Amino acid sequence: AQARKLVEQLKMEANIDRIKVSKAAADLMAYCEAHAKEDPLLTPVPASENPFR
Amino acid sequence: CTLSAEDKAAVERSKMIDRNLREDGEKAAREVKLLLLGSGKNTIVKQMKTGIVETHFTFKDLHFKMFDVGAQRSERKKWIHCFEGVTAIIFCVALSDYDLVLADEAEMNRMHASMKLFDSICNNKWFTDTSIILFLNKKDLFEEKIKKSPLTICYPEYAGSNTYEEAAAYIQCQFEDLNKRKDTKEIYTHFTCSTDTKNVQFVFDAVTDVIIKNNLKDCGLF
Amino acid sequence: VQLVESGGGLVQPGGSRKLSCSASGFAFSSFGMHWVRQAPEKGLEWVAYISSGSGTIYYADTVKGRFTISRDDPKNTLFLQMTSLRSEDTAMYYCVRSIYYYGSSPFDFWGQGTTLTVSSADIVMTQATSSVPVTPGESVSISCRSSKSLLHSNGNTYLYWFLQRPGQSPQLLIYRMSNLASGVPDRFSGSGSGTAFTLTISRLEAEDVGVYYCMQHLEYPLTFGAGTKLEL
Amino acid sequence: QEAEQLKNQIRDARKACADATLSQITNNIDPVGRIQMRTRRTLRGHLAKIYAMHWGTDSRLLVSASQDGKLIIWDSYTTNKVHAIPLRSSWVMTCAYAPSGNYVACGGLDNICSIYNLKTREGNVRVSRELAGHTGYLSCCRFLDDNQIVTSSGDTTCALWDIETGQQTTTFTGHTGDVMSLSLAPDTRLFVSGACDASAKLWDVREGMCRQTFTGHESDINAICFFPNGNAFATGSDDATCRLFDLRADQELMTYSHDNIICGITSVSFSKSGRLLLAGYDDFNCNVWDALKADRAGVLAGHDNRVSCLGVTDDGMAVATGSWDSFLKIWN
Amino acid sequence: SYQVITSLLLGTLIFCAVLGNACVVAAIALERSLQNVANYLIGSLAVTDLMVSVLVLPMAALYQVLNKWTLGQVTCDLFIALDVLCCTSSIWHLCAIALDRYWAITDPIDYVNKRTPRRAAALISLTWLIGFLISIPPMLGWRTPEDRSDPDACTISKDHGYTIYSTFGAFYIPLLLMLVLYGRIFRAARFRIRKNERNAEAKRKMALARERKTVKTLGIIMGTFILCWLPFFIVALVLPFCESSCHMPTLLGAIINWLGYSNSLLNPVIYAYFNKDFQNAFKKII
Ligand SMILES: C/C=C\C/C=C\C/C=C/C/C=C/CCCC(=O)O[C@H](COC(=O)CCCCCCCCCCCCC)COP(=O)(O)O[C@H]1[C@H](O)[C@@H](O)[C@H](OP(=O)(O)O)[C@@H](O)[C@H]1O
Ligand SMILES: C[C@H](CCC(=O)NCC(=O)O)[C@H]1CC[C@H]2[C@@H]3[C@H](O)C[C@@H]4C[C@H](O)CC[C@]4(C)[C@H]3CC[C@]12C
Ligand SMILES: CC(C)CCC[C@@H](C)[C@H]1CC[C@H]2[C@@H]3CC=C4C[C@@H](O)CC[C@]4(C)[C@H]3CC[C@]12C
Ligand SMILES: CN(C)CCc1c[nH]c2ccc(O)cc12
Missing domain, CATH: 2.60.40.10 (Immunoglobulins)
Structure with a gap:
């Protein structure tokens, strides 16, 4: 029966520790600021070092 | 000057690949691409010749490549658009299927489902200007069945003669009525399962008419 | 092939x-x-x-x-x-x-x-030594020099290293001064400046003996050096 | 009788975790501002509609797939075509570039994602292995290693394939609807997939069980991309909106949508820093979204038809985008 | 005061013609989605019209405004040659467009298989060759002593044989060919259009609408070309044989010549700007 499969799949309801959205957003912003200078699309690289110029 | 020997060789290779791609595109341009839907599909394919099935057949100095999209039970709203630009759509429906219910505790009638599919495809936004080559298959079985079981069971509101001609005409009219944009596109209807290659002749004639009408719609003469 | x-x-x-x-x-x-x-x-x-x-x-x-x-x-x-x-x-x-x-x-x-x-502006490639006596298991270095900078404006140094074992055709080792050729032992390494280059072997093996050749691909008038013959 | 109570408990548990929205945290973040994105390289040669694009690891080689039965690998800097492979199935809808750059995969309305070996002694792109076994069209095939590739198919099943064996190592069948896009995490130990059921599920590669599910979208999800940090991913659907999901919170943090955008999203990608969301829309334009402040930092029109594919380089220096106009334009 | 008004009107006409031709060319140039065989012929016609507007019209404007020629015999000969060449090229371009449309309508197999831009290039080359053949004789011969006798008048060659040959090959043979081709197109369109009860009546209404539409665009195609050229070629064919009798009123001849020139203005009007694809491209770019 599909019920057994559904309950088996839903058994994953509480098998993982979770973190609040605030900490996830903090990690996202921390990663974004850490690599801010490593992303030429975010920080325009000088034309001398730009292969596409 | 600004490019080295390797750069020059790479540019030459790139332009050679561009020439090859353009040649392949030109070769593929002169191929008539047809969409097949359906219900006697196997018999139609046999008379014309787990993913998409592609068939190529040449008839009267013209190349046809037919794309049978059957066996794709997955939702077609995400891949129906892949067939833009097809010259025409071949739709196959079996006339004898008016007395079938597709099992499933008779939740639906096979003819009703076939016409629902026809309406959905005809009214689809990606085929607003695509002609449909409609085939009504299994005419002999349809006659043999109406000789005993009237089609009124499939069409409760149909009150008329049970002869083959009248029933076939009524079914064809019902199928054509599904066209909500009849002005933009036509529906070429044919009866099969009693005809030899001349089904290919009908397909060729419909494609020729579609091409001529498209050309006229360019100049403004049609 | x-x-x-x-x-x-x-x-x-x-x-x-x-x-x-x-x-x-x-x-x-x-x-x-x-x-x-x-x-x-x-x-x-x-x-x-x-x-x-x-x-x-x-x-x-x-x-x-x-x-x-x-x-x-x-x-x-x-x-x-x-x-x-x-x-x-x-x-x-x-x-x-x-x-x-x-x-x-x-x-x-x-x-x-x-x-x-x-019976003319061409780049000249020269190798430091024509022959070098070596022994197995020890590191070996081969050096060569170019009369013109091989570092093209695109940032790629067109230096090519080849190994031609006795009674055999040359086998590519390094093609742009930093990349090892396919199907070659990782022992071979390539490094150098814009004009000075060196081919070094971390640990010599019996199959490494032969004549090593250098070449530049900056311009089509390719020049091959006299070679460096390794003898065990 | 049919696990009625289980559904509500998960909803309540996820609701209890909401403390502060992503918008509040990003208020103090200075705006990125308008990004002067301009087309630098233009790619042409496949006449039919382009459907898939993927960057290589070197950030200079990219692979594109078109409906004309041709997938082309391009030299990003010089625009030189390096390889052009004739596909036996011309309905290709996806393509990928192996991390080592040795193998290329592509799939379409057929039920096979042929593996192409770029590095051969014979020096031609020949079919290495055909990963047959799907019942529906292949939506996306992304490589894990030189021997393992994960495939997404319209039959609602994702399958891990061992190229050498040619058989499914692990089959994922938790999706009720067709799976449209495949995204691999930076570590490659887990991946997420989007489906037409307006939901995305977290899949663990080594064990083969769903770990999390996401259902914030209103319509079919078309594209997904993992956030560079690996703790979040973005989803694109027909809602004309894209959403950010975090694996450690199981909740949508913010949505990227505009009033004047009504058509669906066909592609999604992240910049190397993760501050920009490269989303391809059906209005022929690409909108750059500030991942933190959720604002349009730029617009790449670039095309005369629907944007069908796009991606950012591993170095994060340039973004490529393809469209049904049969052109790929690289921006910087 | 009259000269000022004439100069203003003619300058406006020339400027509008130049802008029209340039924008028509740019339509195909900037956007390649319009790069079709028929669109290629339309672009060639637009280029010919641009050449007409830029090269010969200003010289004619100087001729008409001052009522005299003040540029020299060499300049007069060059102007006559260029005008004849470009006008013949435009006429044969529209004729070739009609021929290509007829082939596409009546030969779908050739349209799908054997029609390529090479066909348009060959047609354009043939049209330019015909224009050169028409325009070269005055430079390589003819130009009788009576012709150009007046130093201040840049009269065109009036030799009987040359006049009849040029008029025929420039307007009459193209006119007959266009008439035959468009009659065949009319018959084909009628056949296609001709080929429950309420639905039948609706289909009859649609068929009648299509018949009216095809009657209209043909009437347009023939009438514009006739009103624009036929008087000019009729005059050019009658006056050489009517020197003794015909008075040749100045106003009538000038008006007829200006209608002939405005044929170049109306050709892009009739073909490119009107077209659905071209107007869509104009809307998108603008
Ligand atoms: C019998 C009783 C007595 C009455 C009888 C005597 C008088 C009867 C007069 C009849 C009217 C004649 C003109 C018809 C006007 C008209 O109805 O047009 C309407 C709007 O279009 C514009 O107006 C186009 C407007 C913009 C055009 C561009 C001009 C501006 C720029 C000029 C150049 C300078 C650039 C700045 C409706 O549009 P339409 O139906 O006329 O359009 C059709 C057109 O007529 C066909 O030619 C064309 O065929 P084609 O030759 O292959 O291209 C068709 O494709 C289609 O485009
Ligand atoms: C041939 C060109 C016209 C070029 C053209 O097609 N212009 C198009 C435009 O101006 O729009 C004209 C322009 C000025 C003309 C010259 C002068 O305006 C007038 C002058 C008159 C003398 O009798 C000798 C010829 C001479 C010296 C002319 C020769 C022809 C010229 C050089
Ligand atoms: C189809 C459209 C473009 C036609 C445009 C109308 C043209 C033919 C009109 C516009 C202004 C007109 C000119 C205005 C004034 C004069 C001066 C007169 O002493 C001779 C005729 C002449 C030179 C006219 C002839 C015809 C003319 C050139
Ligand atoms: C004077 N311009 C309007 C040129 C018109 C034209 C084109 N071809 C011709 C042939 C013979 C002729 O007398 C005149 C022409």
């Missing part, structure tokens, strides 16, 4: 001989073709080049005009017409296949070659 050359033999001065190479096991049309000679007890020298589709054809100054190169893509064969052979032309020619695109390995495969017995 396999390249077999044909047409070798003894030709008197002033004669004309055509060398034909048969390509089997790889897409001949895709790859460009090169001819590199090797006079007996001498180094390598580029002869001529033909690109895919015959769009681009180049010849060395000493061979330009007399020797013409043609390709036959349908038959997967290469021809190098030779006219007015001179005493200097007595050398064995090795056919080489290269494909040009980022990440590619030009000169990755070399044929057995065909033996032939007859």
Whole structure:
């Protein structure tokens, strides 16, 4: 029966520790600021070092 | 000057690949691409010749490549658009299927489902200007069945003669009525399962008419 | 992949001989073709080049005009017409296949070659030592110098290193001064400045003995050094 | 009788975790501002509609797939075509570039994602292995290693394939609807997939079980991309909106949508820093979204038809985009 | 005062013609989605009209405004040659467009298989060759002593044989060919259009609408060309044989010549700007 499969799949309801959205957003912003200078699309690289110029 | 020997060789290779791609595109341009839907599909394919099935057949100095999209039970709203630009759509429906219910505790009638599919495809936004080559298959079985079981069971509101001609005409009219944009596109209807290659002749004639009408719609003469 | 050359033999001065190479096991049309000679007890020298589709054809100054190169893509064969052979032309020619695109390995495969017995702003490549005695298991270094900076404006140093073992055709080791050739031991390493380059072996093995050659691909007048012969 | 109570408990548990929205945290973040994106390289040669694009690891080689039965690998800097492979199935709808750059995969309305070996002694792109076994069209095939590739198919099943064996190592069948896009995490130990059921599920590669599910979208999800940090991913659907999901919170943090955008999203990608969301829309334009402040930092029109594919380089220096106009334009 | 008004009107006409031709050319140039065989012929016609507007019209404007020629015999000969060449090229361009449309309508197999831009290039080359053949004789011969006798008048060659040959090959043979081709197109369109009860009546209404539409665009195609050229060629064919009798009123001849020139203005009007694809491209770019 599909019920057994559904309950088996839903058994994953509480098998993982979770973190609040605030900490996830903090990690996202921390990663974004850490690599801010490593992303030429975010920080325009000088034309001398730009292969596409 | 600004490019080295390797750069020059790479540019030459790139332009050679561009020439090859353009040649392949030109070769593929002169191929008539047809969409097949359906219900006697196997018999139609046999008379014309787990993913998409592609068939190529040449008839009267013209190349046809037919794309049978059957066996794709997955939702077609995400891949129906892949067939833009097809010259025409071949739709196959079996006339004898008016007395079938597709099992499933008779939740639906096979003819009703076939016409629902026809309406959905005809009214689809990606085929607003695509002609449909409609085939009504299994005419002999349809006659043999109406000789005993009237089609009124499939069409409760149909009150008329049970002869083959009248029933076939009524079914064809019902199928054509599904066209909500009849002005933009036509529906070429044919009866099969009693005809030899001349089904290919009908397909060729419909494609020729579609091409001529498209050309006229360019100049403004049609 | 396999390249077999044909047409070798003894030709008197002033004669004309055509060398034909048969390509089997790889897409001949895709790859460009090169001819590199090797006079007996001498180094390598580029002869001529033909690109895919015959769009681009180049010849060395000493061979330009007399020797013409043609390709036959349908038959997967290469021809190098030779006219007015001179005493200097007595050398064995090795056919080489290269494909040009980022990440590619030009000169990755070399044929057995065909033996032939007859009778200006070009960058000069020089190697520090013609021969070096070595022992197995110990690190070995080979150095070479170029009269012009091989670092092209695009940022790629067109330095090529080759190893030709005794009784064998050259095998590519390094093609852009930093990248190891496919199917080569990781022991070989490549490093150098814009004009000084060195080929070093972390630990020598019995199969490493041979004559190492350097080449630049910055400009088509390719120049091959005298070579560095390693003896165990 | 049919696990009625289980559904509500998960909803309540996820609701209890909401403390502060992503918008509040990003208020103090200075705006990125208008990005002067301009087309630098233009790619052409496949006439039919382009459907898939993927960057290589070197950030210079990219692979594109078109409906004309051709997938083309391009030299990003010089625009030189390096390889052009004739596909036996011309309905290709996806393509990928192996991390080592040695293998390429592509799939379409057929039920196979042929594996193409770029590095061969014969020096031509020949079919290495055909990963047959799907019952529906292949939506996306992304490589894990030189021997393992994960495939997404319209039959609602994602399958891990061992190239050498040619058989499914692990089959994921938790999706009720067709799976449209496949996204691999930076570590490659887990991946997420989007489906037409307006939901995305977290899949663990080594064990083969769903770990999390996401259902914030209103319509079919078309594209997904993992956030560079690996703790979040973005989803694109027909809602004309894209959403950010975090694996450690199981909740949507913010949505990227505009009033004047009504058509669906066909592609999604992240910049190397993760501050920009490269989303391809059906209005022929690409909108750059500030991942933190959720604002349009730029617009790349670039095309005369629907944007069908796009991606950012590993170095994060340039972004490529393809469209049904049959052109790929690289921006910087 | 009259000269000022004439100059203003003619300058406006020339400027509008130049802008129209340039924008029509740019439509195909900037956007390649319009790069079709028929669109290629339309672009060639637009280029010819641009050449007409830029090269010969200003010289004619100087001729008409001052009522005299003040540029020299060499300039007069060059102007006559260029005008004849470009006008013949435009006429044969529209004729070739009609021929291509007829082939596409009546030969779908050739349209799908054997129709390529090479066909348009060959048609354009043939049209330019015909224009050169028409315009070269005055430079390589003819130009009788009576012709150009008046130093201040840049009269065109009036030799009987040359006049009849040029008029025929420039307007009459093209006119007959266009008439035959468009009659065949009319018959084909009628056949296609001709080929429950309420639905039948609706289909009859649609068929009648299509018949009216095809009657209209043909009437347009023939009437514009006739009103624009036929008077000019009729005059050019009658006056050489009517020197003794015909008075040749100045106003009538000038008006007829200006209608002939405005044929170049109306050709892009009739073909490119009107077209659905071209107007869509104009809307998108603008
Ligand atoms: C019998 C009783 C007595 C009455 C009888 C005597 C008088 C009867 C008069 C009849 C009217 C004649 C003109 C018809 C006007 C008209 O109805 O047009 C309407 C709007 O279009 C514009 O107006 C186009 C407006 C913009 C045009 C561009 C001009 C501006 C720029 C000029 C150049 C300078 C650039 C700045 C409706 O549009 P339409 O139906 O006329 O459009 C059709 C057109 O007529 C066909 O030619 C064309 O065929 P084609 O030759 O292949 O291209 C068709 O494709 C289609 O485009
Ligand atoms: C041939 C060109 C016209 C070029 C053209 O097609 N212009 C198009 C435009 O101006 O729109 C004209 C322009 C000025 C003309 C010259 C002067 O205006 C007038 C002058 C008159 C003398 O009798 C000798 C010829 C001479 C010296 C003319 C020769 C023809 C010229 C050089
Ligand atoms: C189809 C459209 C473009 C036609 C445009 C109308 C043209 C033919 C009109 C516009 C202004 C007109 C000119 C205005 C004034 C004069 C001066 C007169 O002494 C001779 C005729 C002449 C030179 C007219 C002839 C015809 C003319 C050129
Ligand atoms: C005077 N311009 C309007 C040129 C018109 C034209 C084109 N071809 C011709 C042939 C003979 C002729 O008398 C006149 C012309």
